[PDB]
Structure 1
Amino acid sequence: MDYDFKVKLSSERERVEDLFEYEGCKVGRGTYGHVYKAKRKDYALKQIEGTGISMSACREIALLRELKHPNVISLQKVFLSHADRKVWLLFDYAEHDLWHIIKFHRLPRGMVKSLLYQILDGIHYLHANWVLHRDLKPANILVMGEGPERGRVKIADMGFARLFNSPLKPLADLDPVVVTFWYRAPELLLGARHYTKAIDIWAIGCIFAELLTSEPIFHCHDQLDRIFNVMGFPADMPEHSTLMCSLIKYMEKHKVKPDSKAFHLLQKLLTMDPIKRITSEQAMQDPYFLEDPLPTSDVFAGCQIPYPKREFL
């Protein structure tokens, strides 16, 4: 540990402010950090909240070093500035967030057929590599727009992602709340400590029904009443006694036909028990995708984009 080592590393290092105009034009802000648009002197540059490396920051860098997929976001370079001791991240720019399509529409059925397919094949690959996202949100689904690839959505913000190959501690011991209450599973809302990979199957079916109706199905015990509201009460795991038909009508008021292949896939996606819930690979064996028009590689299919660019904050 000496001075000549530091000047050798600083010579080999490069500065993010000397290569990118990340200052200004902040396009995205959240609890994960700030998102800036920058290019070489387009890309999405992320700065993680907090001085030093954190629990989310360690989870970010340990996984996506080795994972690669067309439907998953991919990092190109990390930056480590020792002046302030924080981690800088560089992804490719994603134009449209799925929250933007939902907000603009608040609808052809061809894209939501393919948006359902492209998330489900990616989440099967993510399950195949023995790791769980533990977070599925419409703000986490980002769409390429008029770039090198059209369609081909990417999943990002896996700050809550944890390996489940061998849990040396229970999963709820290091994380009591794993996802936002709009898409919390009732299983972990019952205080389940060891929970399986069926949590993400609940989350995609919630946001698919959100895409089916163009409205949040689950809206603000604060959500447990709402879970019992849309599903009725299940009359057929811990603190069960201390808690003190509806699916068909709730889809009917949102002009969705109850006798359809989408509804049969929707009702099998959400169950109280995780064992009777289907996992990732059996969902794509449903001929709902095969019926009539089928999922395309380009979700736009030549249609022009009515959704605007992400505005700078």
Structure 2
Amino acid sequence: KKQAEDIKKIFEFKETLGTGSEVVLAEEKATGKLFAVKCIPKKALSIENEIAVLRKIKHENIVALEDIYESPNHLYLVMQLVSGGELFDRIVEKGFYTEKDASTLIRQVLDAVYYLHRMGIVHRDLKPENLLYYSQDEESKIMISDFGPGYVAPEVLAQKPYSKAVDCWSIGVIAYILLCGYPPFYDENDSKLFEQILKAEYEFDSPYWDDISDSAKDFIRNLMEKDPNKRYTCEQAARHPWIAGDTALNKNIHESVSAQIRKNFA
């Protein structure tokens, strides 16, 4: 279903879900089914060849590209709507949360980003906001919600040529936040803040990190590594014992993590 004279013949647009192109909550008039439609003005003029590739591939942990419509002046990417809820909301509400839970989340993100990297796509915008649950179910998978300061790799902030390794840094930062509930870099000045990011200066500070395993800390260090050449790839991280083995702990750390999430990501 490529061609439309007017997209409103197809969809009832309801709520804006994000702008940057715009993403709108939409209902297919013929079926009543809901989607997230990314509206892209044609003015932003390779792209059609790439969309044509991903339209045929469904990854368990990535929002699906379900359909594409073309109007006289716009391109519409009809995306799977993810209704399970936000990542942090779930953790705070759960009342019980362990390293195993964080590891399970990261494992899925690694799977998704590995696939994207294999397809030649660098995400460049990995953050907790882009991670959504498929369903309200207890066992719901997590999914990357969309794809094209504190989460950005040093080589990017340094205006250096960068690669897929920048996503791996972002995964490290997300893993850091999942284990303590606050970001690894923060300061009132942007001078030292950027400098701290540029120098990759972070700490597993007490008391927050006292009950976290050495294995988890090692895992994060391999991803939050200043040198993109030394930085773990997604493949390498997925082989780390914290992900692939049994070193993720089973201690309930919900109290501190949720308290920090509420404080820092209110």
TM-score grouping bracket, smaller chain normalisation? 0.7 to 0.9
Normalising by structure 2, we get a TM-score of 0.74
Say if 1:198 and 1:81 are closer, same or farther in 2 by CA, change over 3 A: same
What is the CA-CA distance between 1:17 and the residue it aligns to?
Answer: 2.9
Structure with bigger gyration radius: 1
Q: Structure 2 stretches of 5 or more lacking a match?
A: 250-266
The CA distance in 2 between the partners of 1:246 and 1:206, in whole Å, is 10
- Percent identity, aligned pairs only? 27
1:209-248 equivalent positions in 2, closer than 5 A:
209-219=176-186, 225-226=192-193, 228-229=195-196, 247-248=203-204
Say if 1:256 and 1:42 are closer, same or farther in 2 by CA, change over 3 A: farther
Q: 2:163 aligns with which of 193, 196, 207?
A: 196
Structure 1 letter corresponding to 2:146: D
1:1-313 equivalent positions in 2, closer than 5 A:
13=4, 16-22=7-13, 24=14, 26=15, 28-39=17-28, 40-48=31-39, 51-54=41-44, 61=51, 64-82=54-72, 85-95=73-83, 96-98=85-87, 100-101=89-90, 107-109=96-98, 110-146=100-136, 151-159=140-148, 181-192=149-160, 194-219=161-186, 225-226=192-193, 228-229=195-196, 247-249=203-205, 252-257=206-211, 259-289=213-243, 290-291=245-246
Say if 1:293 and 1:225 are closer, same or farther in 2 by CA, change over 3 A: closer
For the 8 Å contact 1:102–1:214, the answer to whether it is kept is no
What is the CA-CA distance between 1:258 and the residue it aligns to?
Answer: 5.7
The CA distance in 1 between the partners of 2:38 and 2:52, in whole Å, is 17
For the 8 Å contact 1:28–1:36, the answer to whether it is kept is yes
For the 8 Å contact 1:136–1:204, the answer to whether it is kept is yes
1:194-246 C-alpha deviation (Å, 9 max, x unpaired): 22221111111111111111223334696562255489x67xxxxxxxxxx95
The CA distance in 2 between the partners of 1:56 and 1:275, in whole Å, is 29
The CA distance in 2 between the partners of 1:229 and 1:254, in whole Å, is 20
For the 8 Å contact 1:76–1:90, the answer to whether it is kept is yes
What is the CA-CA distance between 1:27 and the residue it aligns to?
Answer: 5.5
1:91-133 C-alpha deviation (Å, 9 max, x unpaired): 222012335446768x412322210110112211222223322
What is the CA-CA distance between 1:44 and the residue it aligns to?
Answer: 2.3
User: What is the aligned-residue RMSD (CA, Å)?
Assistant: 3.6
Normalising by structure 1, we get a TM-score of 0.64
Count residues in correspondence: 243
List 4+ stretches of structure 1 deviating above 4 A: 12-16, 55-60, 102-105, 220-224, 227-231
